[PDB]
Design goal:
Elements (H helix, E strand, L loop, with lengths): L12
Length: 12
């Protein structure tokens, strides 16, 4: 999946 991240935003 994509999703941002726990803290980061590395969307895929």
């Amino acid at each position: 999946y994509c999703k941002f991240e726990x803290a980061t935003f590395x969307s895929c």
